[PDB]
Amino acid sequence: VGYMDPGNWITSMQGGAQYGYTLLFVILISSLAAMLLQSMTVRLGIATGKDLAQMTRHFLSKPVAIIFWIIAELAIIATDIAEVIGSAIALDLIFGIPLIVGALITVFDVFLLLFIMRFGFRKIEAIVGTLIFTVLAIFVFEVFISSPQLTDILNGFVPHKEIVTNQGILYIALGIIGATIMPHNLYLHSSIVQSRKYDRHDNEEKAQAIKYATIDSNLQLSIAFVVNCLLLTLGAALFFGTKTNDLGGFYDLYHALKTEPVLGATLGGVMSTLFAVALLASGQNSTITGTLAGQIVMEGFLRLSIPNWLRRLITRSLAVIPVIICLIIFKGNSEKIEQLLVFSQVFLSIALPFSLIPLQLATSNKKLMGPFINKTWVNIISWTLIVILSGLNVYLIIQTF
Amino acid sequence: VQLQESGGGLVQAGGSLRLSCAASRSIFSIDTANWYRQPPGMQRELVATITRDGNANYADSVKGRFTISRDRARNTVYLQMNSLKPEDTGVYYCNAAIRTTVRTSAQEYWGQGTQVTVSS
Numbered sequence: 001v002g003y004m005d006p007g008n009w010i011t012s013m014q015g016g017a018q019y020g021y022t023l024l025f026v027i028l029i030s031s032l033a034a035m036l037l038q039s040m041t042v043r044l045g046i047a048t049g050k051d052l053a054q055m056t057r058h059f060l061s062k063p064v065a066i067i068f069w070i071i072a073e074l075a076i077i078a079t080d081i082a083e084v085i086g087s088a089i090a091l092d093l094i095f096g097i098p099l100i101v102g103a104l105i106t107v108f109d110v111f112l113l114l115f116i117m118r119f120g121f122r123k124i125e126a127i128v129g130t131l132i133f134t135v136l137a138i139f140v141f142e143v144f145i146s147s148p149q150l151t152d153i154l155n156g157f158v159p160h161k162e163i164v165t166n167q168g169i170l171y172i173a174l175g176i177i178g179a180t181i182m183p184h185n186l187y188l189h190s191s192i193v194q195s196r197k198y199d200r201h202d203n204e205e206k207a208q209a210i211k212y213a214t215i216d217s218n219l220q221l222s223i224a225f226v227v228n229c230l231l232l233t234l235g236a237a238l239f240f241g242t243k244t245n246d247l248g249g250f251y252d253l254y255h256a257l258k259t260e261p262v263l264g265a266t267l268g269g270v271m272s273t274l275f276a277v278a279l280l281a282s283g284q285n286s287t288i289t290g291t292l293a294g295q296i297v298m299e300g301f302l303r304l305s306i307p308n309w310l311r312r313l314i315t316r317s318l319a320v321i322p323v324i325i326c327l328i329i330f331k332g333n334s335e336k337i338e339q340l341l342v343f344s345q346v347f348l349s350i351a352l353p354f355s356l357i358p359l360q361l362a363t364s365n366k367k368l369m370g371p372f373i374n375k376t377w378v379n380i381i382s383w384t385l386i387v388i389l390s391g392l393n394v395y396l397i398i399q400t401f
Numbered sequence: 402v403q404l405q406e407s408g409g410g411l412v413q414a415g416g417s418l419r420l421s422c423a424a425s426r427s428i429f430s431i432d433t434a435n436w437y438r439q440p441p442g443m444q445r446e447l448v449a450t451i452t453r454d455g456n457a458n459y460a461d462s463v464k465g466r467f468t469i470s471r472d473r474a475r476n477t478v479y480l481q482m483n484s485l486k487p488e489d490t491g492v493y494y495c496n497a498a499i500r501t502t503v504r505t506s507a508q509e510y511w512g513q514g515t516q517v518t519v520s521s
Contacts, residue, residue: 092474238503244432244453246503251473255429259502265427333455334473 001185001289002220003227004132004282006086007079007345010249010338011175012228017235017248019169021156024232026173028157030180031225033385035218036378037181037356040363041190042213046198046206047372048362051191053300055368056358068354069301075183075351076294078344079286080319085341087283088323089250089334093276099337100327103320109284110312116284128281135278136227138257138271139234145262146237153233170396171346177389178348180224183355184293189217191296203371210372249338250279287312350397353390360386402426404512406495408479411518414487418517420480422495424510432507433498434478436469439514440491448493449480463489485519493517 002008015023045051053072057065087109088102097105116124163169193213198205238256239246246252257263258272291312298304298311323340330336360382363374374382403425412418422434436449449469451457457469468481478497482489492514498507 096474242504244430244500244507246430252430252503254474255427255476256503258427259429261502269427330455331470335455 001286002224004285005079005082005179005182006250006279006282007082007175007179007341007348008224008228009231009279009282010341011172011179011345012231013235013253014248014338014342015169015172015176015235016232016237017239017246017252018172020236020240021153021232022160022163022169023173023176024153024156024229025159026163026176027180027225027228027232029159030177031221031228033177034181035221036381037186037359037385038189038217038221039214040359040374040378040382041186042193042210042217043369043372044359044363045190045193046196046210046213047370048368049200051194051296051300052187052355052359052362053190053297055362057301057303059358059361065301068358069297071351071354072183072187072297072301073294075348075355076290076297077315077318078347078351079182079184079290080315081323082341082344083283083286084316084319084323085337085344086250086279088337090276090280090283092334093251093254094273094280099332099334100324103323103327106283106320107313107316109287110309110316113284113287128278128285131274131278131281135271135275136230138275139230141263142257142260143230143233143237148233148237164392164395167396167399170392172342174349174392174396175342175345176228178350178352179345180228181352182348183351184290184297186355186359187296187300188289188293189213192292207372247335247338249335251334251338287316290315349389350393353386353393356382356386356389402428402499402501402510404495404497404499404510406493406512406515409493409515409517411520412485414485414519414521416485416519417481417483418485420482420493420495420515420517422478422480422497422512424476424499428476428499429502429505430500431471431476431478431497432500434469434471435496436467436478436480437494437496437514438489438491438517439494440488443491445494451478482517487519487521490517490519 041052056068084103084106087106088099091097091102091105092099163173196209198209235248239248239252254272254275257275258268260268263271291308294311294315295308326337326340362368364379405423405425408419408421432453434451435447437445438448439445446460448460448463449467451469451471459467466484470479472479494514495512497510499510500507
């Protein structure tokens with residue numbers, strides 16, 4: 001969740017590898033936006049009785065609520081598609097299992113997650129922790145030895161018009177925003193935030209809970225920002241300014257780490273293998289959070305209750321189908337399945353407004369929210385974000401079609 | 402860095418083989434690949450061609466039966482030869498444009514051909 005999701009990796013790394021440091025601003029303005037939007041959901045969770053799905057359902061009739069539920073469920077399926085592609089690529093790099101077979105393997109990683117469960121949570125998550133830290137150390141090493149120009153990075157943080165001019169920078173930009181502001185984290189946070197310690201009617205107990213939840217929500221989002229910048233700089237350092245126009249996917253990073261001159265041959269192979277294991281670990285951890293979010297969305301909109309293993313199997317089954325169809329059409333082209341990997345996050349950008357608007361409506365309401373209320377500052381910046389985001393989505397959809 | 406071929410050998414008409422074209426050391430990318438062959442007493446004939454974007458083309462004598470492909474995880478160009486005929490017998494060569502690192506210029510490489518014999 002955040003810096004572990006493969007969508008952030010592919011969008012940031014391809015943004016840097018294809019358009020230099022330009023999209024850095026899109027990483028910042030989105031990472032800030034999330035910090036605000038999450039902070040609203042937190043309040044919506046703690047101030048009002050229950051989470052976002054129940055509120056949106058409460059303000060809508062059953063048909064339109066079913067439509068919203070279709071949009072949200074499709075977003076969850078999109079993230080699942082992202083980590084399905086991630087795990088498939090990892091199994092192709094480590095064990096040589098083709099993508100069409102690995103995608104089929106990703107249906108039973110629940111079983112495999114039980115097998116890991118038998119080995120204890122703390123130990124395996126510590127192994128994955130040292131793995132992620134080691135891989136990040138490799139990336140910091142690559143950026144450090146690339147001799148980057150700091151003034152060009154800080155120049156990259158400055159916005160440019162070209163971000164909306166051509167379809168490429170705008171496409172990767174929508175992918176970055178959709179990957180950093182995941183719509184399912186709003187429904188998830190708006191309910192998991194209500195498990196803290198406070199009396200439902202005593203109010204500074206609540207404001208204390210929102211103080212904490214907001215502080216944490218900004219901490220991990222800060223880390224996700226830093227990691228996203230480190231990855232965009234990684235792809236920009238390895239594949240930008242190249243005569244062959246390497247798009248900068250997971251395979252390009254794999255062979256770039258494996259053929260790095262100073263990094264050696266066997267050592268570089270160790271680095272690349274660790275990166276692949278970190279990609280599989282990236283594809284294994286998002287599933288539980290996706291399952292809880294799907295429970296909140298389904299029980300909130302449709303008021304239907306099914307077990308978490310069942311909806312996990314259903315969401316995974318629906319997620320593998322477009323991956324398999326993509327692999328059959330393009331004959332297992334890795335660059336194409338990575339293009340699908342980006343398109344999933346772009347679809348998250350498409351699905352963002354349907355979750356942002358009811359959040360604004362419920363948060364601005366005086367009766368529902370009471371003392372905790374959207375300061376008109378929040379209403380201004382938030383309505384600005386909804387307007388400009390929906391405008392960018394409609395603009396891209398109309399331009400491409 | 403040398404281009405190494407494998408997967409050839411002896412097979413009966415109707416069977417299948419799979420040629421493997423790899424490199425001696427770790428490579429970043431094989432941008433373009435061509436599978437040539439030479440039958441006894443005939444000229445060197447271009448059989449398969451795969452490009453950077455993944456598109457491929459085959460000779461009319463081999464189209465529909467042969468399939469060149471790129472394994473990107475291992476940087477290995479494969480030639481899947483199905484429904485083999487006795488005239489497919491010959492020495493198969495692999496020509497490939499290897500890119501040692503990311504920013505190195507793409508270089509041309511050939512390789513010692515492998516023997517393919519379709520008997521009876």
